[PDB]
Amino acid sequence: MYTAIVNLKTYREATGANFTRFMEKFEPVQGKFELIFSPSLLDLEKAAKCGKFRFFAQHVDAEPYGAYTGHVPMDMMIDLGITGSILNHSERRLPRDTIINTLKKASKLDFTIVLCVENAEEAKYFREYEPDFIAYEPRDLIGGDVSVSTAKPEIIEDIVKIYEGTGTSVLVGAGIKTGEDVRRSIGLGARGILVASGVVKSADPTKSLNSLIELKLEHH
Amino acid sequence: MYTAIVNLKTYREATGANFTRFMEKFEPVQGKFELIFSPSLLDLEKAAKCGKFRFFAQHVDAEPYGAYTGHVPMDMMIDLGITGSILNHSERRLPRDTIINTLKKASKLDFTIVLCVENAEEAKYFREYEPDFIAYEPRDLIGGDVSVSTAKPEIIEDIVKIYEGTGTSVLVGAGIKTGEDVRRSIGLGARGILVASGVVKSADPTKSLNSLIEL
Ligand SMILES: [Cl-]
Ligand SMILES: [Cl-]
C-alpha cells in the first residue's frame, strides 16, 4: 500500500473541543492508501483510546519514565497505544545528536519514525541510522507559484536514489496541491505524502483528501 | 493561605492508567495550605475533565493556535480549562527571551505562571515582569546530606527580600524532606513548597503530604 499522513498541527479547526467534530467528517477507507492522522500532543490520549484511525504523534522524546518535567516519552506513548511519530519537522527542528539518540531507541522498540529533512545532505547524513520513512520538505517545492507537477524531477529522484536498496520509504511533504502532483510523485519513486492546511483549512475537508488519494480503480 | 504544589513529572506511579488510580485514592486537603497538582502533558486534558483537584501544566508555549507542529499553546490550555503552568524547571530550562515573551502573554490573559529559578541574579532579572509565583531550586539545597533545617538561612532570605512588597509569592523547591523543613521555610518568609518524589513514590501519598504540611 501507499501512505498518506494528515498533520493537524495546532490549527483551531482540528484541536481541543474541535478534534472530535473534525474527525467525524472522515470514515475508515479500505483501498490502496493507508490513512494516518497526526493529532496535537494535548489531544493524543483521546485519539489513542477512542479514535477510529491509526494515529502518529507530532514529536517524541527519547527519555524513559522518570524525573523529566515537561517531556513526552516514547515509552509512555507505546503504553497509551500510539505506534509512531513525526520527528524534526520544519516547525519543530532538533539537534543532530538528539535525532540519532531517538532513531536508535525507536529501532530497538519497533516504534515507527517519520523523519523530516530539508535537503540531500541531511538525507545522506541520517541514512545509516535507518529511519522507517523520510518526509522531504525542500525549499524548491515551497511557494504559491510551484508544485511537483511543475518542478524539475531531479528534486525527488535524488532522495529516492540515496535510499535505493534500504528499507526506508520516501514521502513528499511540500508541493502537493492536486491528485496530479500525488500521481507524479509515485511515478518518481515516492511511496506517499505528508499534507496539512490543504485538507484541514478546506471548506470541505473530506472532498479535498479524496481528491488527493483517488486512483480510479475498477472493481468486480 | 499557603500553597503546596506536587509535580508528577513523568513518574510511572502517576501517569496514564496509574494517574486515574492515584487521584481516585488521594484525599482532598483542608486547612491553611491549598494543594495544586502538575500532571504530565499527555495526561493534562484528562485531568482538566476530572477536576477533583486544581491542575497546572508542567511547561507552556507562548505561540497561539496555528501552524506549530509539536507545540503546546497557552490558548489551547485555556480552552481546555487549565489556568496555570510551571515554567523554566531545572529539567525543562528555556532561553531568557522565550521566558519574557511567555510572562508578558500570561499577564494579558490572566494565566498563572510558577517561574523556577536557581540563584539571586535570575530572581532579580525577572522581577520587573511580575511572575505570580517564584519557585527556588538552588544548588546549595540539593544533596542527600542537605536540607532547609540544616542550611544557612541567607539562602532563602535573599530571595524573599527581592520580592518584598510585590504581588509575588516565594516557594521553596529543593531541600524539603520533613515537616521541620517546611516550618523553617515559612519562618524565613516563604509562602509554600514545590515537591515531587517524596509524595509521588510513597506507599501512602496522602499521608506523606500530610506529614509535610502539618504546622
Ligand atoms: Cl518512574
Ligand atoms: Cl488556526
Author numbering:
A (entry chain D): 1 to 220
B (entry chain A): 1 to 215
What did the original publication write about this model?
Triosephosphate isomerase (TPI or TIM) is a functionally and structurally well-known enzyme that plays a crucial role in glycolytic and gluconeogenic metabolism. TPI accurately and efficiently interconverts dihydroxyacetone phosphate (DHAP) and glyceraldehyde-3-phosphate (GAP). Unlike other thermostable archaeal TPIs, TaTPI forms a stable dimer in solution, which we confirmed using analytical ultracentrifugation and size-exclusion chromatography.
Crystal structures of apo- and G3P-bound TaTPI contain four copies of TaTPI monomer in the asymmetric unit, comprising two homodimers. In addition, water molecules around the active site of apo-TaTPI are expelled from the active site and would be replaced with substrate upon substrate binding. Thus, we needed to re-confirm the oligomeric status of apo-TaTPI to make it sure whether the interaction of Cys-Cys is physiologically relevant or crystallographic artefact. These results strongly indicate that apo-TaTPI exits as homogeneous dimer in solution.
